[PDB]
Amino acid sequence: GSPEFNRYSKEHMKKMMKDLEGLHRAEQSLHDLQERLHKAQEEHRTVEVEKVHLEKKLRDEINLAKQEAQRLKELREGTENERSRQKYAEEELEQVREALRKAEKELESHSSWYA
User: Fold this and answer.
1) Contact at 8 Å (CB) between 86 and 80?
2) Residues forming beta bridges with residue 46, ordered by sequence position
3) Residue 47 and residue 112: Cα distance in Å, rounded?
4) What angle do CA 88, 89, 90 make, to 5 degrees?
5) How many Å apart are CA 68 and CA 27, to the nearest integer?
6) Whole-angstrom distance, CA of residue 29 vs CA of residue 62
7) CA–CA gap between residue 107 and residue 93 (Å, rounded)
8) How far is CA 93 from the centre of its chain?
């Protein structure tokens, strides 16, 4: 193949390993998000239990985590080093972390009011 794949192999593999582990954790986040809602019901009985699930909220949260996953795919494909025009790579990791933070904040808010 092109020798560039070998020249950039170090950044490519570092991004690929880190960001795919994150992508797998984003699938895990789809499922952990619904499992956490399930516990917000199972133990706590959140006041919005009738609405907190359904196609609407389940699809919305896994779509948020899918946005996270899309960027983990985008990054794992290998952005190489953060040159001045490529400074969005680890910035996108913070945006991935924002997708995750929004989900964690959602779960907190869904469990903040119960019984």
Assistant:
1) yes
2) 114
3) 9
4) 105
5) 10
6) 8
7) 21
8) 10
As beta bridge partners, residue 114 has 46
- The answer to whether 44 and 72 have CB atoms below 8 angstroms apart is no
DSSP of 9-46, one letter per residue? HHHHHHHHHHHHHHHHHHHHHHHHHHHHHHHIIIII-B
- At 112, the amino acid letter reads S
Query: What DSSP string describes 72-96?
Result: HHHHHTT--S--TTSTTHHHHHHHH
Method: NMR
- Judge residue 59's burial from the number of C-beta atoms within 10 Å of its C-beta, 0-12 exposed, 13-18 middle, 19 or more buried: exposed
- Our CA angle for 34, 37, 43, nearest 5°, is 135
Phi/psi for 46 (5° steps) reads -45, 140
Distance between start and end Cα atoms, the chain: 61
Under the phi-then-psi rule, with left for phi > 0, alpha for psi from -120 to 50, and beta for the rest, what region is 80?
left
Report the half-sphere exposure of 67 (CA within 13 A, side-chain side): 16
**114: three-class secondary structure by DSSP:** strand
Q: Are 51 and 24 in contact (CB under 8 A)?
A: no
